[PDB]
């Protein structure tokens, strides 16, 4: 399943200095980008528009523009009312997935609200001042109707357009390569195993152990580094039709 995630970061230094930057991921692939220094949402793949028309897409272009400027000023004004202190960080994570949707908002890196049903609701562990913000946001009937239309109708119709358009790149397979090394000793030693240059993301590497994090390469391929304190290294992956990558020490 390939969820579509739309991310936003809005930073407020003082009441004069602010920035808002955004992005969209389709599964692991990033399909859009949108910076503060730009009056448009930028497409990244030749299929980023999916099965939407130019007129359809341009309408989306017009909505986001109005929203970015309004969001900014709504937040500066909320700052006075709620007497909050600068700096302020706000983040938004919105989207859906074709089989339900979502729209979460965070402040200083903690959840505060979200868009359920037809309106805004707080999160279980939120401050009292959030009640004031929820009370005001829920007055704008047109915005509440517009977020519903966007999540219930526009997003799901959009994601499909993408899936029948980016079927090559999504169902693509890249083979990894692998090698061993000797790190810094803890008379103990450290056996490090390096697996790099694979795609898609789901992978499997063990010593047959500290299986490291999956780290990104700049060509949308991935990288992994599992270690052991003290023998073989084995890697499974979809690209390897059962035939695993066994490297011996």
């Amino acid at each position, epitope marked *: 399943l390939f969820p579509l995630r739309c991310l936003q970061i809005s930073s407020f230094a003082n009441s004069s200095w602010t920035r808002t930057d955004g992005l969209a991921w389709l599964g692991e692939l990033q399909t859009h980008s949108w910076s503060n220094d730009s009056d448009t949402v930028r497409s990244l793949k030749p299929w980023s528009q999916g099965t939407f028309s130019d007129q359809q897409w341009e309408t989306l272009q017009h909505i986001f523009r*109005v929203y970015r400027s*309004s969001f900014t000023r709504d937040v500066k004004e*909320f700052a006075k*009312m709620l007497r909050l202190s600068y700096p302020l960080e706000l983040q938004v994570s919105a989207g859906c997935e074709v089989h339900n949707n979502f729209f979460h908002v965070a402040f200083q890196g903690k959840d505060i609200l979200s868009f359920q049903g037809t309106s805004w609701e707080p999160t279980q562990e939120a401050p009292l001042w959030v009640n004031l913000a929820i009370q*005001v946001l829920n*007055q*704008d009937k047109w*915005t509440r109707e517009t977020v519903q239309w966007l999540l219930n109708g526009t997003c799901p119709q959009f994601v499909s357009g993408l899936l029948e358009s980016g079927k090559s790149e999504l169902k693509k397979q890249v083979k990894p390569k692998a090698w061993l090394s000797r790190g810094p000793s803890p008379g103990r030693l450290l056996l490090v195993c390096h697996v790099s240059g694979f795609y898609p993301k789901p992978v499997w590497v063990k010593w047959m152990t500290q299986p490291g994090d999956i780290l990104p390469n700049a060509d949308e391929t991935w990288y992994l580094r599992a270690t052991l304190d003290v023998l073989s290294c084995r890697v499974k992956h979809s690209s390897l039709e059962g035939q695993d990558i066994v490297l011996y020490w």
Partner: T-cell receptor, first 114, second 112 residues
């Protein structure tokens, strides 16, 4: 349902002045405008609720207080002759349709003499 | 941000008139027309959103063309009690979080 007392007011120069405004509904949002005869309304103060007191689109020597929802008093620290004007109070709330209308008080006329 | 026209005008009773209001406010939520008698508070006449092109409150009738950002107030069968100041204000949000923009008003004198 929005009240302003008194309706008229004479006072001497250099003394303090307080202007009453009250509303029997429960509207949070409230505004103070100052309007010179034969001219426009200028916002001088407003409030989003109790303990909220923001300066408006005009720099007056006045101050407001919102310690109670229903009352929004305007106060002149030390009155000068140039404070002679008309002062209107107002509020915002949900009404006949599904929108937030603004309702104005009747107003108060202040004359400051020497 | 919000303009009205004319500044003032003088008509005789029994005649119709039309008052203009132009705005550059974006984004747009709704627009109201107020009537202010000398030495009194303004009185709500009408409020309109973009999805409406007409509203009538008694002898008063407001239209709103959202596409050219203009609304006009039309007084039918004027009389001496229509002498007042007529104000038009625009709001840029559908909540109390908005900003209100006022016109300088229009003074209307009605003679016998």
């Amino acid at each position: 349902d929005i009240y302003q007392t008194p309706r008229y007011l004479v006072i001497g120069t250099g003394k303090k002045i307080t202007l009453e405004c009250s509303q029997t509904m429960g509207h949070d949002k409230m505004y103070w405008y100052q309007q010179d005869p034969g001219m426009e309304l200028h916002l001088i103060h407003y409030s989003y609720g109790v303990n909220s007191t923001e300066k408006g689109d005009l720099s007056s020597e006045s101050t407001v207080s919102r310690i109670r929802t229903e009352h929004f008093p305007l106060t002149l620290e030390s009155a000068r002759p140039s404070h002679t004007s008309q002062y209107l109070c107002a509020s915002s709330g949900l009404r006949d349709r599904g929108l937030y209308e603004q309702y104005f008080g009747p107003g108060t006329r202040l004359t400051v003499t020497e | 941000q919000v303009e009205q026209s004319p500044q003032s005008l003088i008509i005789l009773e029994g005649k119709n008139c039309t008052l203009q209001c132009n705005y550059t406010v974006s984004p747009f939520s709704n627009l109201r027309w107020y009537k202010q008698d000398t030495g009194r508070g303004p009185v709500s006449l009408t409020i309109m959103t973009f999805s409406e092109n007409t509203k009538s409150n008694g002898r008063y009738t407001a239209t709103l063309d959202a596409d050219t950002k203009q609304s006009s107030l039309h007084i039918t069968a004027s009389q001496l009690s229509d002498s007042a100041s007529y104000i038009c204000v625009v709001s840029d949000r559908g909540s109390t979080l908005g900003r209100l923009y006022f016109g300088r008003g229009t003074q209307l004198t009605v003679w016998p």
